[PDB]
Design a protein around this ligand. Structure first.
Ligand SMILES: C[C@H](NC(=O)[C@@H](CC(=O)NO)Cc1ccccc1)C(=O)O
Ligand SMILES: [Yb+3]
Ligand SMILES: [Yb+3]
Ligand SMILES: [Yb+3]
Ligand SMILES: [Zn+2]
Length: 610
């Protein structure tokens, strides 16, 4: 069974493996560089090992030290988004299982794709700068030299020097703080991660952060202006951790803290161990976007404990996490609610497949990422096709209680390891050996490796969806003389989730006639709704239906936050509207230099600019 990581230029785990990183760096805001040493404890997996190769991207290497002396190394030629391989010549050949420590002195580039450096103007407080990282999938190599593949798990410690007014946090347990001996305007924050993790989980923030406690093992961190609102928004967090522990087994990471990032954070959430990062666009005021916390919590088992061996197997991380996310929300709010969210996810899958096209290779569950940048291929597919496959399997094999038994056993089986789809499938067959005849009914080749919508759609309870579908059908089939029958009372029995689903249904049939959209604004006043998911879908419906009044609203939401879920389609829709096209491109050009580097790249590709 031969499997190597095609996104990594480092020596693979079969040659050598990193066991520990001790990181000592200083955050230089004047220069937008992180400077320090990465000491890697590396274990040879081979006899007579004399060299090894590490991933780097846009790093400046000052030197490499083993056994107190400088050693030879060479940087290869850059291999586009993969970066440049660093070969290091070991001073003494290693036997199998021998471990050494390699200390690499390095400096990042200001344009590190792992990092966003924010001026004071780009923060809430307006007095201090801010830095955050995002290493998933393959940007850890833009921060430090490493075997940048999830097929290798290491523990880590780190000492981070920062201006003394600021606070540093990491994906790790805080292990104290002191004044910096070599510069008193500074502080050193120390950190310890005792659980082996893939390098994509290394995370760093530095900024003017304050914390508030919201449960026995949870602090919320943000700038001061966001603290009170974040505490309320994420108050279900401890109750979700308890349900998750019930489903997954023991939470092993100690703390579960939340960090609410500035608005340019590119994702809804990122499951950094001990410190989940979230977008401030979750702060709807009513806890209605909390499925995102349920999702990040669930990664504490599926993803951070049982990890995909390479990114071709990313659905293992996300499809399982969505399956557990939806169970948490099902426990809190009922089984009809789990089916409603499950049925919504099928529609998001329809969208993604329609968008790439039904034979596009990114619509496959297991993807081949050789020479594909993971950020380009990134979509809802591994989430929703992965969830669809699990929910189909749940229904085939006897229901949620039985399938949840399999999930817990799966996590116990593969804790602290990195696995492939074939490892998952083999264990699925082993666990359900008394139901192999059922298992053999599944069209594995189609579910796993075929493009498009899955060969079979699961059964979904429709109770909560029906009202959404009816209202959306009323609007789609309305003629001019029917617009007067709509009224704000149409919405009185719909939850925010149902309103969001009404908009998703209607957006799938966009455009609507412009008079319909204007009437919808007259009677429902969707312009007033600040809930980001609902506002996103409503602005998209308005732009796709060619409402000029919506252009400044859509542009302002595209640029005042940077969650890619929202920014990328808003910009794409604005460019596809002839009236807003020149402005969409201009606004992108003007904002580009102060955007997140990955977001800037993808919006550029979407708009075909550069
Ligand atoms: C498209 C994008 N997706 C994410 O941010 C997900 C990232 C993730 O998988 N974290 O674990 C986390 C997530 C999971 C489920 C719902 C929303 C967000 C987004 O929502 O902005
Ligand atoms: Yb300690
Ligand atoms: Yb009529
Ligand atoms: Yb150009
Ligand atoms: Zn996830």
């Amino acid at each position: 069974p031969e499997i190597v990581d095609t996104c990594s230029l480092a020596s693979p785990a079969s040659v050598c493996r990193t066991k520990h990183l001790h990181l000592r760096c200083s955050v230089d805001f004047t220069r937008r560089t992180l400077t320090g040493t990465a000491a890697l404890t590396v274990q040879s997996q081979e006899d007579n090992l004399r060299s090894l190769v590490l991933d780097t991207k846009d790093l400046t290497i000052e030197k490499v030290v083993i056994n107190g002396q400088e050693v030879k190394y060479a940087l290869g030629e850059r291999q586009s988004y993969k970066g440049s391989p660093m070969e290091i010549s070991l001073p003494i050949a290693l036997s199998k299982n021998q471990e050494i420590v390699i200390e690499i002195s390095f400096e990042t580039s200001p344009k590190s794709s792992a990092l966003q450096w924010l001026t004071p103007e780009q923060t809430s407080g307006k007095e201090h700068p801010y830095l955050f990282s995002q290493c998933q999938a393959i940007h850890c190599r833009a921060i430090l030299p490493c075997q940048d593949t999830p097929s290798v798990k290491l523990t880590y410690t780190a000492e981070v020097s920062v201006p003394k007014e600021l606070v540093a946090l990491m994906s790790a347990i805080r292990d104290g703080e002191t004044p910096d001996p070599e510069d008193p305007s500074r502080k050193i924050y120390k950190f310890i991660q005792k659980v082996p993790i893939p390098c994509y989980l290394i995370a760093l923030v530095v900024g003017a952060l304050e914390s508030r406690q919201i449960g026995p093992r949870t602090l919320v961190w943000s700038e001061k202006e966001q603290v009170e609102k974040s505490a309320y928004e994420f108050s279900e967090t401890e109750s979700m951790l308890k349900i998750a522990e019930d489903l997954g087994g023991p939470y092993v990471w100690g703390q579960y803290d939340l960090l609410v990032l500035p608005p340019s954070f590119p994702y809804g959430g990122m499951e950094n161990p001990c410190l989940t990062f979230v977008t401030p666009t979750l702060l709807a005021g009513d806890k209605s976007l909390s499925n995102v916390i349920a999702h990040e919590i669930s990664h504490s088992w599926t993803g951070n404990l049982v990890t995909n061996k390479t990114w071709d197997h990313f659905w293992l991380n996300e499809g399982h996490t969505v399956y557990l996310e939806r169970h948490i929300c099902g426990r809190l709010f009922g089984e009809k609610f789990r089916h409603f969210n499950a049925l919504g996810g099928w529609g998001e899958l329809q969208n993604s497949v329609k968008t790439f096209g039904e034979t596009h290779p990114f619509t496959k569950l297991v993807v081949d990422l050789t020479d594909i940048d993971p950020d380009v291929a990134y979509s809802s597919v591994p989430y929703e096709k992965g969830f669809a496959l699990l929910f189909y399997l749940e229904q085939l094999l006897g229901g949620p209680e039985i399938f949840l038994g399999f999930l817990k056993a799966y996590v116990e089986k593969f804790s602290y390891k990195s696995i492939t789809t074939d490892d998952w499938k083999d264990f699925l067959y082993s666990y359900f050996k008394d139901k192999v005849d059922v298992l053999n009914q599944v069209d594995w080749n189609a579910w796993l490796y075929s493009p498009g919508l899955p060969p079979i759609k699961p059964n979904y309870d429709m109770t909560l969806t029906n009202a959404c579908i009816a209202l959306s059908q009323r609007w789609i089939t309305a003629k001019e003389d029917d617009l007067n029958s709509f009224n704000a009372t149409d919405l009185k029995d719909l939850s925010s989730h149902q309103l969001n689903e009404f908009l998703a249904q209607t957006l799938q049939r966009a455009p609507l006639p412009l008079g319909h959209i204007k009437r919808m604004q007259e009677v429902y006043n969707f312009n007033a709704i600040n809930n980001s998911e609902i506002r996103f879908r409503w602005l998209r419906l308005c732009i796709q239906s060619k409402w000029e009044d919506a252009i400044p609203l859509a542009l302002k939401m595209a640029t005042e936050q940077g969650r890619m879920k929202f920014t990328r389609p808003l910009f794409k829709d604005l460019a596809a509207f002839d009236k807003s096209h020149d402005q969409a491109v201009r606004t992108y050009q003007e904002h580009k230099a102060s955007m997140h580097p990955v977001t800037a790249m993808l919006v550029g590709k979407d708009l075909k600019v550069d």
